Design a protein around this ligand. Structure first.
Ligand code: 08K
Length: 127
C-alpha cells in the first residue's frame, strides 16, 4: 500500500546522447501527449496512497509515467530512442494490466497511445 521510490531520472555514470530521434521524442512525441486533455493521470508517478490503490505496486513492478519520461528527456538520460519508446510502451501496458477494458483511465491511455503511434510512425531516420 506504500509508494515505492520513483523511477530513476539521473545516473551520472550512464552514458548519454542527444540524437535527432531523441530530440523528436521530446519536441514532438512528449509535447503532443503532455498537452492532451487526457494527459493529467500520466504526468507523474501513480500515488497509490492518495488514490487508494494499495495493490497497484503489488501488480505493477515496472512503473512508468510521462513525468519521469519528461525528466529523462530534458536531462538527457537516454542513449537511444528505443529506450524512450520502451518507457512510453511500459506506461501504457501498465495501465492496461492494472485496469479493465472500457474503464475511463483505459480510454484515456488508448487515446494517448493512438497519438503516440501516429507520431512514432514518422520517427526520423537517425542522422
Ligand atoms: C495512470 C493510472 N493508471 N491507473 C490509474 N491511473 C491513474 C493515475 C493518476 C490519477 Cl490522478 C488517476 C488515475 C486513474 C484515473 C481513473 C479515472 C479517471 C482518470 C484517472 N486510475 N488509476 C487506477
Amino acid at each position: 500500500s506504500m509508494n515505492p521510490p520513483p523511477p530513476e531520472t539521473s545516473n551520472p555514470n550512464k552514458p548519454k546522447r542527444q540524437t535527432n530521434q531523441l530530440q523528436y521524442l521530446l519536441r514532438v512525441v512528449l509535447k503532443t501527449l503532455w498537452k492532451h486533455q487526457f494527459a493529467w493521470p500520466f504526468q507523474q508517478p501513480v500515488d497509490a496512497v492518495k488514490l487508494n490503490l494499495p495493490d497497484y505496486y503489488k501488480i505493477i513492478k515496472t512503473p512508468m509515467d510521462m513525468g519521469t519520461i519528461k525528466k529523462r528527456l530534458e536531462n538527457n538520460y537516454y542513449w537511444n530512442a528505443q529506450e524512450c519508446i520502451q518507457d512510453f510502451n511500459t506506461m501504457f501496458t501498465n495501465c492496461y494490466i492494472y485496469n479493465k477494458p472500457g474503464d475511463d483511465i483505459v480510454l484515456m491511455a488508448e487515446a494517448l497511445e493512438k497519438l503516440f503511434l501516429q507520431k512514432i510512425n514518422e520517427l526520423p531516420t537517425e542522422e
